[model samples]
Every structure is written in structure tokens, then in C-alpha cells.
Target: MNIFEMLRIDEGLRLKIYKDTEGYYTIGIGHLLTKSPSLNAAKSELDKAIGRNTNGVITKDEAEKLANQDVDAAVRGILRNAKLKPVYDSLDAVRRAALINMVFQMGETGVAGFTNSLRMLQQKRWDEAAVNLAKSRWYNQTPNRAKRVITTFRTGTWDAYKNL
Candidate 1:
């Protein structure tokens, strides 16, 4: 499956401002509104997308475009990371999307802390990589999502997120 399709399932969509699991304001497929780099500006932009807030309703196209931009940034962040770049390049498209999804959820800094997991991934030790990922707070915090991503790494297949 494509990254957008996978993320659409994983992150889910919300046109209005909704509190994320962490109680942070989020919208448009997990786009963080509060505590963002430019809070009001970002909110206004999304609001403008719908021609006035209307209770934070942004069009699906605009929401998807925002998600696409976030995905693009996540990809660029992974490539710029010295520890992640080589391993990312060594992977197939599905595995590559797995990395991008992790970076998207965890952010570059958070994913960088997965030293052992990254090492196993770089070595092409699929099972070991999945095991390492399972040993994280991320795995427990969002079990379903983390499991899907880890399975993607383990099997190198798009089927993990295909139906789920």
C-alpha cells in the first residue's frame, strides 16, 4: 500500500480539532496544531482551507495535501539522518515506507534513539529488527500501529497494513 493509504488508516482523519491520545490538539490526519512551529499561522492556514473555521472543517483534499507535506518532510528527515540514511536506502519500498511511517509518528529525534533496532535493520536481520522495535515505549503506547509497522519490517510486505 502507499504511504498515504497506510497513514490514513493508522492516523485516521479529523476535520475538526480533536485531542490526540496525548491530549495535544491535532487535526487533518494527525497534524499537530497546538505546540507546532507556527501555531496560529498553521491553524489559520487550515482554517483558510475551509474558507473560515466552520468548527475546524478542512476539505479532504486540503487535509490530504497537508498529510503529504508531512510525509515528505519525514522522508527528507530520514535521508538527512546519518544513522538512518544508509539503512533506509538498503530497504525495499515497503520497508522504506515502514521507516517513513515510524519517523512520521515518532519524529526524527525519537526514532533516532532506536539504536539497536536501526542496527538490526541495517544488518537485514528482519526478526531482530522487529524484536528491537517491540522493546520500546512506542510499541506499548500504540500497540496496533506499532505492531503493523514492525510486521512490515519483519515481512517486508505491504500486507501488514493492507486490510487493517
Candidate 2:
């Protein structure tokens, strides 16, 4: 499955403004509007993404557009780290999506903190990398999401997380 579809499933679509788990005002497909410095700027950015005004509500098509941009940011964040480039490049698409998914949830800095797991991924030690992931607080906090990502890391397939 593609990152957009995966994230849409994981993050869930919100056509209207709502508080995320942390109470951040989010919209569309987990798009953090209040996370921006100003709501106006956030609306402007969202409008730019959808090529029209949102006015605080959006269509599924608009949500997907926003999701694509967010997913692209996640991908860029993973590749932007100089040390991660080679490791990310060596991965197949499914394996790469697993990293991208983690980055999407935890941010680049958070994922970078997984030094040992990333190192294992670089060496193509799939089971070891997954073990490292399973041992994290992230695993305890979000067991199902973490399990799917770890499964993807180990198997290099979307089978564990893919919708039937």
C-alpha cells in the first residue's frame, strides 16, 4: 500500500477542525493547523494545498490532497538526515514506507533517536530492527500501530497493516 493510504488509515480523516490527542487543533487528514504559528497562516497553507478555500471544512478529496503533502513531508524528513540517506535508500518500498510511517508519527528527530534500530535496518537485520522497535515506549503507548510498523519492518510487506 502507498504511504498516503497507509497514513489515511492510521491517522484517520477529519473533515472538520478537532483536537488531536495532544489537543492540537487539527483538520483534514491529521493536518495540524494550530501547530502553525497562526491559524490564518495554516488556513492559507491548506488552501494552497487544496487550491481553494477550506473555510474550516473539507471534502475527502481535499483530505487526500493534504495527506499527500504531509506524507511527502514525512518522506523528505527521513531522507533529509544525512546519516539516514544511505540506509533509507537501501530499503525496498515497503521497508521504506515503514520508516516513513514512523517518521510521520514521531517526527524525524524522534526516529533518529533509534540509533540501534536504524543501524540494524542499515545492515538489513530485519528481526533485530523490529525487536528494537518493539522494545520502545512507542510500542507500549501505541501497541497496534507500533505492531504493524514493526511487522512491516520485519517482513518488508504491507500484509500486517494492509486493509482487506
Candidate 3:
């Protein structure tokens, strides 16, 4: 019902800092610990920030802002990826966003490698496309993320990837 509740639900809240599913030190809802020059810094200015926030600490507000920025970066990635643009244009807004979110994690080349998925997408076969996505190495490696994309792609709605 509220932004805070939404993020907490989307990315379970942790009052203290902790490592994420990917081993990134995160705090609050989903703030990947930043403050770095860890070779993974996004911008030159971010060199001032640090990474590997092992034993780091932060305020709740800071964590929330970081989560918001994370969401923004994903949208921006979808918008600016020249390679992603044509695919984005091919689908309706919701489906386009769903695919972009997958590409956000997998990269364009990675998603492109899903040949059957792409073919089904072009043919507007949503269910087959989603199933095709689930049938991949990517699915093996990131089943939860893949399932989220698969369900959202099939239904044209959000899938939280919660375990049944």
C-alpha cells in the first residue's frame, strides 16, 4: 500500500546489513553496500564510494534511496541499450519492460542467446516464449529470477518469485 511496504515486500527488510543472494553486502531493504573503488564502480565519481561492505552500517533512509536508485538504473539500462531498443519496441509496454528486466540481469547478448525465446517473442507466443526462457542455462543458474521473468512475460503482469 506504500512505497516502504512495497520495497520491503519486494526485497525483504533487514534492519542490519547483510549479504544479498549474490554476495553483495546489503542493508535495509535492498541497498547493495556502496562507497567504492572496487573495480566495479559504475562511475568515476563513484570511486569515492566503496564496496565489499563487510561489517558496514547504514541508516534506513540511505538504504531506501539506494533501492530506488537501483530500480532507476534498471529502467535506464533498458531505455539506453541500443540493442535492447528494437526488442523493446516489438512488444507492448508491459511485456517490453518485463523483457528488459531480464536483459538487465542477463545482458543483451545473454538474452539473445535464448533463440527459441526470441522466436516465440517475435511470433507473439507469450506462453511458449516464457517456457522457452525457462528452458535454458540461465534458468538453471538463476531459477528464481528466470521464473519471475517467465511468469511476467507469460501473463503480462508482475511475478514476485516467491517460493510456493
Candidate 4:
């Protein structure tokens, strides 16, 4: 399944997934969404939120409009942050997804701030990375999420996070 299909919207939270004039699918969160200023403008914003290179052309208004396009944007942003990029790149797809999910819950900076964990991963110290990940503030703040990602890292399985 695609990323959107993998996302499970929480109860009572409404979402609208529609195509812009350009045919790019954009998902808006919350109700009473306003019309996009322009299709190109909305596409630019969506590209930024999804971590695609935007040629340094986003306006302040576009940034605001796409700040939280949907769970996918948030997830993409969490994975796009500089510090987490290496970690996300090094992990297997499943582990990467779990890590992104953890970052979604914990915030990108929150997970990226893990200095020791990054160090471990950078050195190719898989065991150490797993251990350091478990000792993070995020591990304490969200034990279940930490456990899920750590398990994926340890076992090399994306299925580990399928339900999480």
C-alpha cells in the first residue's frame, strides 16, 4: 500500500484527500478547509512538506498553508529533518517507517536531538544504536513507539511495525 493507505486517521478527526487542478493529490486535515490560493502554490507547499526539494521558493503564506497538510506531511517532515535523514537512510524500510512514526509522535527535533544514538548509527554500531535509542527521552516518553522501532532495527523486519 501507499503511504496514505498506511495512515490510519484517528477517530473524530476529519480529512479530505482531493486532487488539485494539477492533479497532485493533497490531503487536508480538519474541516472547513479553504480553497487553495492556486494549484501551483498548493503543489509547491505539498512538495516542501513531503521533503521534496522546492528550489527555495516557498512563500510565508504557502508555508503556513502547508504547515500541517495531513498525517503524511507531518510524517514526511519528521523524516526530512537533517539530523534524522542519515538515520532514516541507513535503516531498512520497515525500521525507517517505524522511526518516522516515532518522530511523528515525538516531533522531528525531539528524535533528531539524540546525539548518542546518531553517533552509534553513524559508526555502524547496530547494537549500540539500538541500545541508545532505547535510552532516549522518546523511549521514556513513548515506550511503545520506541520498542517498535528498536525491534525493527534489531530484527530487520518491517512487519514489526505493521500494526503499530
Q: Can you write out model 3's per-residue Cα lDDT over 52-107, one digit (the tens) per residue?
A: 34234445665666666766766566567665555666887667756756654555
Instruction: Give the top-scoring candidate (lDDT).
Output: 1
What local distance difference test score does each model get?
0.84, 0.81, 0.60, 0.55
Task: Report the alpha-carbon TM-score of model 4 versus the true structure.
Answer: 0.51
Candidate 2: regions farther than 4 A off = 35-55
Model 1 stretches with alpha carbons more than 4 Å out: 36-55
Task: List the candidates' TM-scores in order.
Answer: 0.88, 0.83, 0.62, 0.51
Q: What digit string (tens of lDDT, one per residue) describes model 4 on residues 1-164?
A: 22332233211122333453334444442212225655566556556564765443444444334434545565677556777777767766655655655554445777778878776766668788898888766678657646756776666665554654
Better of 3 and 4 by TM-score: 3
Report lDDT (Cα) of residue 129, candidate 3: 86
Q: Which candidate achieves the best TM-score against the true structure?
A: 1
For model 1, residues 1-164, the per-residue Cα lDDT tens digits are: 68889898989998777767766667888887665555465667567644666456677787888898899999999999998898899999989999999998879999988999999998999998898899989999899889999999999988777667
Better of 2 and 4 by lDDT: 2
Looking at model 3, residue 46 earns an lDDT score of: 28
Which lDDT tens digits does candidate 2 get at residues 80-117? 89766777999999998888888877778888888999
